[PDB]
Amino acid sequence: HEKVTIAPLVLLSALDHYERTQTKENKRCVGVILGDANSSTIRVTNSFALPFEEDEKNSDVWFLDHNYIENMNEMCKKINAKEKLIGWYHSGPKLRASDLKINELFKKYTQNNPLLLIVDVKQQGVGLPTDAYVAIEQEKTFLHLPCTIEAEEAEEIGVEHLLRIRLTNQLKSLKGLQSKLKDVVEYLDKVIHTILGKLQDVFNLNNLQKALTVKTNDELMVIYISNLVRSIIAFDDLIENKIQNKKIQEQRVKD
Amino acid sequence: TKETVYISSIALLKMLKHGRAGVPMEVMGLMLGEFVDDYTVNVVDVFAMPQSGTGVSVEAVDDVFQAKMMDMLKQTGRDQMVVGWYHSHPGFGCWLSSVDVNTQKSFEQLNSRAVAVVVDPIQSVKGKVVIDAFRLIDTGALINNLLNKANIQALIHGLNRHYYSLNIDYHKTAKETKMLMNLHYEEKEESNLAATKSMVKIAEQYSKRIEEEKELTEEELKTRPKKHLSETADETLENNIVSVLTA
Amino acid sequence: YGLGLIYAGFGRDTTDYLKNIIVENSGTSGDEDVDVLLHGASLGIGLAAMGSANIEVYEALKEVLYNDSATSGEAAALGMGLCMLGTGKPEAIHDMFTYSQETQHGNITRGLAVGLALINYGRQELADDLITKML
Secondary structure, eight states: OOOEEEOHHHHHHHHHHHHHTTOOTTSOOEEEEEEEOSSSSEEEEEEEEEOEEEOSSOTTOEEEOSHHHHHHHHHHTTTSSSOEEEEEEEOSSOSOSTTSTHHHHHTTTOSSOOEEEEEOTTOOSSSOOEEEEEOOOOOOOOOBOOOOBOOOHHHHHHHHHHHOOHHHHHHHHHHHHHHHHHHHHHHHHHHOOHHHHHHHTTTOOOHHHHHHHHHHHHHHHHHHHHHHHHHHHHHHHHHHHHHHHHHHHHHHHHO | OOOOEEEOHHHHHHHHHHHHHSOSSOOEEEEEEEEOSSSOEEEEEEEEOOOOBTBSSGGGOOHHHHHHHHHHHHTTTOOOEEEEEEEOOSOOSSOSOHHHHHHHHHHTTTOSSOEEEEEESSGGGSSSOEEEEEEEOOTTTTTTOOOOOHHHHHHHTTTSOOEEEOOEEEOOOHHHHHHHTTTOOHHHHHHHHHHHHHHHHHHHHHHHHHHHHHHHHHHHHHHOOHHHHHHHHHHHHHHHHHHHHHO | OHHHHHTTTSOHHHHHHHHHHHHHTSSOOSSHHHHHHHHHHHHHHHHHTTTTOOHHHHHHHHHHHHTTOTTHHHHHHHHHHHHTTTTOOHHHHHHHHHHHHHOOSHHHHHHHHHHHHHTSSSOGGGGHHHHHHHO
16 A cells, blocks of 8 residues: 655755756746655655756647656666655646646656655645645546655754744634635536535534543543642742741841 | 855755765765855765775775766756765764775865765764764965964974864755744644544553652652652643643 | 054045055955955955945945955955945945845855944934844
8 A cells, every 4th residue: 555755855855956947937847756665655765856848839748858767767776776766756836737747658667656746845835845646547636645754763863953733723624614615616606425524513512522521521620639739849849948048038147 | 264064954864864874884975066165165965976895995986976977967957066075984083984084185186175074873873963074184274274373383384184173064945944844734633633542541641640749749758859849740730731731 | 454443533545545455456366365455455444434434435345245255355344334334325225235145155244244233323213124124
């Protein structure tokens, strides 16, 4: 199966690459990823920029090489064996008509099915940058795949050296529902189950936490009593401080 | 003056990735970028040389490899010139191996601003990376720049080259910095899940703080310790704030 | 550098005198011997022309930045701030402010930071716009 682990180097390369090649809005940057993917856990362990150009006449007419792919994987192999190519890279502008159409060409020199990592590697979006997709036709049919990170023991320690709640999640929740409604209205208009049906009745009854509140309450007294002992304890420590001050004053008066 | 070495996120990480896998019994390699000197030197990127059975010396820089790699980098925007060379070695405060200096010296007849940087993964598993950068001294620069320096003046008229330590710094963009901290979606959705499963386990976590408190009170008796108790009190407060938040 | 120290507070002659040295030595940057000469040159002129604001000096020290010499750019940057002290153009603030961002030598960047602080001397609330911009 699938369960995808993604190098922080992948995200950071894609970022740096887009500015450094002077790639604007209304030009794509396309790439390759390789690692190990013949396993239940797809390991993305490296990646590389691919030469990509798109024409004035129609911008779903485009050029990707395959020779930069022929001999570059056989330089990837030579530092770390097991870092052949299984798929591909995108920075956006996202979800175009010919963003389907790199799939049939990338099927020519992959060993399973092109894995499509679109990533918002300008880091401009809000939330996830990773718009991961298994590249399946049928058109831009595009089942998404959830999973970023897992990296090496050395890299994570290095990451931390570089860098050195309920509401935020609720606001996200509100925005999805609000978006979902807007879509449903649009969808009726254009046209002229179960997941939605569990997302209404189930939550109707902090909402869920209500039913639970009965059980919570009993333990809730107990954990409250525990905080009260701690308050007494702070008072006890306090009394010593008052004495310390009291002593000093007393010595100053003798003297 | 002399150099201050800004290493990029991807450069630092590549240095650690290659060095660890290439182990002592070494792999060697090249640093890429450029700078305009006297206070700005940048290492953008790095790549690995492919292990050669004569340890990590000038003989291990495969010139065809480096040439093919530089050309291919160029076609994807990432190619630049050598700003020095890096590796992996036994680790020394006087130079990580004998080979790295003897390689560095050949480079030094060409360049006059090329560094040797190595990270040693032996001492980078105490949870704090041990990384060094050293270069040899040059005449007519490190005496013209930094009684005056009698010491370093007799040193340069003398040896002509000797190790000196270069500073470790970092430089990274804001774009990287923003979009690490939404990974480190998994964190927000993971946060909901974690709250739910915490309330499940609370049966046990309850009981142990009950125990902690019994020890705590007993302790204060024996003394008559206080410090622990206060820390011990604070912690318990934090945990309840969390227990209440869950539900 | 030492002449510019003395003749601050009555730099009228010395500013002009020094200016002729600035324009001269803008070509020469091939040796650290000239960078140290042009470095004093920039200190001096900024110091001599303090308290009045001569745009003539500002424009001269600015071409030393475009030629991008590592020592001399620190003295020129700080020098524009000294010269224009408390009597700057609003335009001068904006041009200076953009150039900090442009410059990729550490020293020129350091000198334009301090440079920007000087040029607002005595403004009070009138500097509030620039405080925000630097932060």
